[PDB]
Amino acid sequence: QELFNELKPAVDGANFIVNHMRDQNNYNEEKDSWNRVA
């Protein structure tokens, strides 16, 4: 409970980092697709 309360900012930060990385990867993949079309 208290341990979960202390670890919740870390879990939220990790999830935010994961979402940021995944969005960046999808963005880069679409850019590579545009490069291949070119």
Add this chain to the structure above:
Amino acid sequence: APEVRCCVDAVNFVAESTRDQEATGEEV
């Protein structure tokens, strides 16, 4: 308990990768 081992390995991999990029950039 694959969680502890697998994610400790993953975190160590990102750390080692970051070290490699830092060394490469210092040589550059």
Add this chain to the structure above:
Amino acid sequence: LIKHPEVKSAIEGIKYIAETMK
């Protein structure tokens, strides 16, 4: 605590990040 969905999502996300950089 591992069964919490947020913890599991973070765990698989760290695995995904490591696989991506590999």
Add this chain to the structure above:
Amino acid sequence: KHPEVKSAIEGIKYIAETMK
């Protein structure tokens, strides 16, 4: 306190200091 766990902890610390 396994060696690999401490190494991972220091790895997170090193990443944070690197971005700083």
Add this chain to the structure above:
Amino acid sequence: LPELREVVSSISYIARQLQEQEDH
């Protein structure tokens, strides 16, 4: 648990930096 506290701080700092980069 100073080690876990410092790890929480590092993760929060990384997330904050990424959020600032997102706003930029």
